Structures are given as structure tokens and as C-alpha cells.
Design a binder for this molecule. Structure first.
Ligand SMILES: Nc1ncnc2c1ncn2[C@@H]1O[C@H](CO[P@@](=O)(S)OP(=O)(O)OP(=O)(O)O)[C@@H](O)[C@H]1O
Ligand SMILES: Nc1ncnc2c1ncn2[C@@H]1O[C@H](CO[P@@](=O)(S)OP(=O)(O)OP(=O)(O)O)[C@@H](O)[C@H]1O
Lengths: 401, 401
């Protein structure tokens, strides 16, 4: 029994993710598609459009045989970390293959690059420090030390996000020596981006996207906004940002993960004067901050994730548990074959196991429902517990729950 | 030139608060009424229905010359600390008198009882000893001891609220040593209660309660609706309380003012399944905790105010500052006269002092404003720092700002 690992956030799951889930089992020759998926808040930092449950349902119907949560711990993080944790989990489940889309359909410049870099790493740090002492900044001196190599005609721009994430998966693998072989391909009824789609739904358009989405995906989104009366946007949580920053002191906000020393003053000062999440952001920007890092920071503020929480939990080199979000027939059989093999707990009912990282995913799960109006919100908050793990019948369409 | 102090929440100012003020000036023989007022969160633990700037504007034209904010420090407390703080504020302001309403026009029985409990305090306490030793609860013992000296029919009714408030005022003037003379009248355009007028407005219908409202009150009220788009209810804040108990740890929740040892768990159990502040209060209520005390707790859980900060600030024997909301030309005169004599700062613009208790005040407002739909919330927020004292001219209608 063979599975291919898929590092994903389906937000929503679109034609590109569909083609990638069919080609996964095609090109990696594994009978099973196992995805680790960001739960509620994601790597880009934003809230998911729809809960991890219903996105699970867009996935199980599009050819993903198994779906596990990527803990907030790994999910909302710099890609170097995000990659590590995700691949880590795909290896605990013993996925022999890994498969990603990318701006370079060629795996060879990925492998070549990483191998090349570790081949020279000493050179890299000598030239980095040789620029640094000359007064160069961190990313500059790194950009220079790195462009001292790799800059040949190869391209594979690692200025491109998928090349980044993919290089980082591959790096996590090699570094870890995982017996999981990586694969990649380029990205192109039709296909537009998850984000173009998203902003198109923000623009009061859903079926406009239907060419860009499979059936299950749209069918799912519709029932979500139907039930809870919203698509979740970063802006939707602005009040709770305001509120949350309203009660905190400087020293306490200093301790939140991804808040650099001294910036707490700027944050606290700016949130007052910002009638918009956008204004808030522009008031916050420093060149030591990407925009995604600012979003991530804002999430950590929202969920009150502390430097010591995150750093005492990031230390470990294995994954704390496996959260099972959903499974197919194939998925079920795979999880059954390898069940006893897991070196870490398999969490189905939350009741079974309690963990600080788990406590953190639940935390995010409660923060997620806040823009939901009640009674709907109180009922939403049930799903993290008394939700029996989703199951779906691959052959002719059945959910057994 | 002699001042009569009033202890008031004005929620909102109605024709009866008008009775209070004008009867005050007339009965005490003072030409100046100074009111110390709970601003955005009141004695029983709930929010004001309209901003303290507005209600200041109301009273200023209804015959109050000075409006001083009762710090949150003393405002959300049971009657004795509430009265301790407000009476310290009035004593700082050199009021010859303190005029409080009850169902009694007679100032005497408050005096008689006051001295009675004041002198028997030894006897009373010693009598609580024996009763706790027999196995009674403390309140039981308390009722038993009070009953021995008190049950003579004086008859001071400690049931009717404003009577209790009266008694504690008398008590504070007594142990404080203030040169203050308590006065009083029976409470009774026949006036209607503040609350039923609230329910009126809440029901969106402000038209039933008019004849009971001074005109300016009606104006500034509807002006607050039209300006900021709501009347404030406790339920407005439920979602935010729901955020607060999400982002707190039970150890952290134990340090919240009025969360007594061990209750934080009942709290957390109750919040996740409660769709309303009502239901929440319902599951929460205990014998150890009355409705209003729980509203106080829930409020402190909103402001996330810690116990040690609180104790620190309650330790101060006089009010940390005198906070100026508004003044007439008379109030301005009286102020300029007694200002030299104030022993703690007079605050007009917020930049004029820094104290932990004022931080508390400003944060209380920052929480208060949240229900306002953004950007209007931000505009409102600009006031606490923005608004300098509201100045009315009794020679009719000149506001100078
Ligand atoms: N059209 C496409 N072609 C090829 N690969 C694709 C793809 N769309 C996604 N993938 C790959 O499918 C995997 C899942 O992508 P996530 O679920 S992490 O979302 P995302 O891809 O960043 O969003 P998007 O860019 O708006 O589509 C990734 O490795 C992708 O490279
Ligand atoms: N109609 C009236 N007659 C006499 N005194 C009155 C009065 N209305 C108010 N006062 C006095 O005015 C002062 C301020 O009362 P707060 O502003 S604290 O509200 P509250 O009166 O408790 O509200 P309620 O009980 O729901 O009606 C008190 O000394 C009152 O005795």
C-alpha cells in the first residue's frame, strides 16, 4: 500500500489543486493521496475561507485520500519551518513520495541547488560575514553570498513562492534524510489562482469562479456561507485585533511570537488610529517585516501566541501528534495498515489526547468562529470535539456520517 | 460660595435625576452642584448606554455645574468601595454637603444607624466570631450579628438600593473625617425609573419615555444614536467577552479581579456553549455570586483587570486624580477657586497626568467603543484623548468647543 504526501491549504480547493491531486497518484504511483493541510489560519497568515472541515470535504472529493491538520504551530510560520513540520508529518505517516506544483516543473534544479548549497555552506557564511563586517544587512549579505553561486542561467527563481516552498520541502527531506522521494511540476474547467478566485468571491461573485473550481468545491463553499453567513476575511477579525490590543500592555505584547523588541509601541499606537486593517498595516511596515510576516504577527496577536509557547514547542525535531481530519476508503485502509506504526498519538476524538500544541490549534479554532453570528457560532464551536472524523466513499459518492 | 456633592451614574439623566439635583441645591442651600459620575461602566457591572461625554452634556444643562468622572477604580465595586471613592472625590472638591436620595426624606435614620454600627463595630465583629465558630457561613453570621443591634425598628431599610448607597456615603464621610454634611430626600411630570427608560430606548422606541426625559437629554441621546449608530447594551460586548476567555489561561483567569479562587473553571466551562450574555450569566450564577457581582467580574474580564493592580490602587486613601468631563461657567468658577487647593491633579486633557488608575479609565473606554461599527468606532475613540472639558453657559446655550 503506497501513499504520496501533499503539503496543502485548500482555500478554496480549485482546478489546479484537483489536477495536482490526480497527477499525484498518477506520477508518484501511489494508490493513496495523503495531505497535511493548514487548519484555520494559514501560512500566508490569513484566516481560511471556510473551516478545515468543509475544505476537507472539497479535498476528499477531488482525489485526496487522507487529510491531516497541519498544526497552527507549523501552519502559521516562515516557509522554512512550515516545510519542516509538514514534510515531518508526511514522513510519520510514511509517505514514500512527495508531490508539489511549482514555477519550475523541474525537480533537478531543486535537488541541484540544495546539494550545491550544502556543498558550499562554509563559503556562504564566510562571504555573508565578509559583507556583514563591511556593514551589509542580513538579507543583502545573504543575497550576495548566495549570488556568489547559483546565479547561472538555471533560473529557478527562488524569488517565486512555489520554488521557495518546494526547495524547502526538498531541503527538509535531504536534511532529514527522509526515505521519501520528492516530485514536482509546473502550474497553469479552466484555472485561475486561489487568490484571484478569493478576491472574486469578495467581489460578490461565486459562479463566476465555477470554471476555476471543481463541483465539490463550489458545492461546499455555498453551504458554508449559507450556514454561517460569511466567508472569513482577515478584515473580519479587525475588531478583535482592536479589542485584543486594547487590553494588553507593552511588555505583554513584547512577548507575543513574531513581535520584535520595541515594535509593540508602534503597534499599540497605530491600532488606535487605524479604522482599517489596511491602514493598520501601512502604519506598521518596517523593512525587517514582509507583509506576510506582519499578517502572521497579527494572527499571533489575535490568538495570543507567545514567544515561549512557540519557541519551546518549535524546538522538537518530530511532530507532536497526528490530527485526522478526513479519510476516504483508500485513506481508511492506509491509516489502518500503518496505524500501529505511528510514533506519536493519533488524534481522532479530541478527548483522547491533550497537548500544548493541540491546545493551540483549539485556541485558533475558537478564534476562527468569532465573526460568526450566534446561535451559529456556539454551534460552530462544537465541531472541534463532537465531530466524528469525516469519512467519504470514493466509489459513488457517500459520506458515512 | 458652597458646594453640594452628588453621587450619580446618570443612566441616562431623566427628570428624576433633575429632581435630585435641584432638590439638592435647594435643600442643602448650596449654589453649586458637583456630581461625581461613573463614566462607561457602572456600579452593578454593566455598560453605560451612551458616552460619558454626552451624559456630561446632558447634566450640564440640567443644573449640574461640575462633572467629575468617578474612576473605574472605584466605579465598578459594591456600594462601600464605590461610596468610599466617590466620597473621597467629593471631599477633595470641598463640597459642604453630600445629597443622596432614598425612599426617605429624612436624613436621621442613616445617621442613627451609622453611629450604631460605627460604635458597635467591635461588638459586631466579636459577635461574628462566635457565629462563624458555631459553623455558620460568613454572611449568615453577619446577618445574625447585625440582627442583634439593628432589629429595633428605626427603621433603616438596607434593601432599597439607594438607601444602602446612602448609608455607605454616611459611613465614608464618618470614617474619613470629612467636613461633609449628608442630606437626603425621598425619591419620587411624575418621573419614571432609569432602567425602564433604558428598555424603552433598547426596544428602539425612545418615544414612550419622553415626558420623563429632560429635553436636552432627548436631544443629546438621539444625537448619540445618529452620531455613533447605536445604544449600548451588555449583550453588545458578549462576543468580546467570548474572545477574552478564549485568549486567557485558567491561571491567568485566576488573577482577574473578582474571579475568586477556583471559579475560573466554571467560567471557562460556561463560556464556550453560551450564545448569549444571558445564558452565560445563567450557567455562571452561584450562591457565592449575585447577578450584579458576576456582571462586575465579567466586566473586569472584559477590561482584563488584574487583582494585584486593583489592590495596589484601592490602597490609595484618596482619589488618584480629579477627572474633568465638563463644567458650567459656575463649575468653571468654583473650580478655578478650589483648584489651587486640590492635592491631586485636575485632568482636562489626558496628556496632563499619568496614573495607573487613569490607564484603567482610558482602557475602559477603548473596550467601551468596540461595538461601534468601524470607522465610527475610531472617530469615537479619538475623543477620550481628544475631548477637553465640555463647557456649557447657563446664560442659555453656549458650548465653547
Ligand atoms: N494550477 C496549479 N498548477 C500546478 N500546481 C498547483 C496549482 N495550484 C496549486 N498547485 C500546487 O498544489 C499544492 C497545493 O497548493 P496550496 O493548496 S499550498 O495553494 P497555492 O498553490 O499556494 O495557491 P495557488 O498558488 O493560488 O494555487 C502546492 O504545492 C501548489 O504549488
Ligand atoms: N425621581 C427621583 N427622585 C429623587 N431622587 C432621584 C430620582 N432619580 C434619581 N434620584 C437620585 O439621584 C441620584 C443619582 O441616581 P443614579 O443616577 S445612582 O440612578 P438610580 O436613581 O439608582 O437609578 P434607578 O434607581 O434605576 O432610578 C441618587 O441619589 C438618586 O437617589
Amino acid at each position: 500500500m503506497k501513499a504520496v504526501g501533499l503539503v496543502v491549504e485548500y482555500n478554496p480547493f480549485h482546478n489546479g489543486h484537483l489536477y495536482h491531486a490526480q497527477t499525484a497518484k498518477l506520477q508518484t504511483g501511489c494508490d493513496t493521496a495523503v495531505a497535511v493541510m493548514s487548519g484555520h489560519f494559514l501560512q500566508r497568515g490569513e484566516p481560511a475561507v471556510v473551516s478545515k472541515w468543509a475544505r476537507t470535504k472539497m479535498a476528499l472529493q477531488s482525489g485526496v485520500d487522507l487529510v491531516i491538520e497541519l498544526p497552527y504551530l507549523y501552519a502559521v510560520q516562515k516557509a522554512d519551518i512550515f516545510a519542516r513540520g509538514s514534510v515531518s508529518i508526511l514522513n510519520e505517516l510514511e509517505c514514500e513520495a512527495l508531490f508539489f506544483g511549482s514555477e519550475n516543473g523541474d525537480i533537478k534544479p531543486f535537488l541541484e541547488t540544495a546539494q550545491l548549497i550544502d556543498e558550499h555552506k562554509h563559503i556562504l557564511n564566510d562571504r555573508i560575514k565578509e559583507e556583514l563586517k563591511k556593514g551589509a544587512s542580513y538579507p543583502a549579505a545573504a543575497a550576495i553570498a548566495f549570488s556568489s553561486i547559483l546565479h547561472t542561467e538555471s533560473a529557478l527563481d527562488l524569488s517565486k513562492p512555489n520554488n521557495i516552498l518546494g526547495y524547502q520541502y526538498v531541503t527538509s527531506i535531504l536534511t532529514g534524510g527522509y526515505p521519501m522521494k520528492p516530485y514536482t511540476t509546473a502550474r497553469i474547467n479552466h484555472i485561475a489562482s486561489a487568490t484571484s478566485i478569493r478576491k472574486a468571491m469578495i467581489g460578490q461573485n461565486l459562479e463566476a469562479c465555477l470554471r476555476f473550481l471543481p463541483a465539490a468545491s463550489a458545492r461546499e463553499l455555498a453551504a458554508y456561507r449559507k450556514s454561517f453567513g460569511l466567508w472569513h476575511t482577515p478584515e473580519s477579525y479587525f475588531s478583535y485585533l482592536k479589542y485584543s490590543l486594547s487590553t494588553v500592555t507593552a511588555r505583554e505584547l513584547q512577548q507575543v511570537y513574531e513581535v520584535e523588541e520595541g515594535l509593540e509601541h508602534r503597534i499599540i499606537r497605530s491600532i488606535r488610529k487605524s479604522s482599517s486593517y489596511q491602514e493598520f498595516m501601512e502604519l506598521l511596515k518596517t523593512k525587517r517585516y514582509t507583509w506576510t510576516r506582519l499578517q502572521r504577527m497579527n494572527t499571533h496577536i489575535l490568538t495570543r501566541t507567545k514567544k515561549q509557547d512557540m519557541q519551546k514547542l518549535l524546538d522538537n525535531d518530530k511532530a507532536p501528534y497526528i490530527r485526522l481530519l478526513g479519510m476516504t476508503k483508500k485513506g481508511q485502509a492506509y491509516l489502518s495498515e500503518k496505524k500501529k506504526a505511528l510514533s506519536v498519538p493519533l488524534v481522532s476524538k479530541l478527548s483522547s489526547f491533550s497537548h500544548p500544541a493541540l491546545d493551540l490549534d483549539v485556541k485558533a479554532s475558537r478564534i476562527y468562529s468569532l465573526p460568526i453570528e450566534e446561535p451559529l457560532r456556539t454551534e460552530f464551536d462544537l465541531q472541534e470535539y463532537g465531530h466524528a472524523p469525516i469519512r467519504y466513499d470514493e466509489d459513488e459518492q457517500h459520506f458515512l456520517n
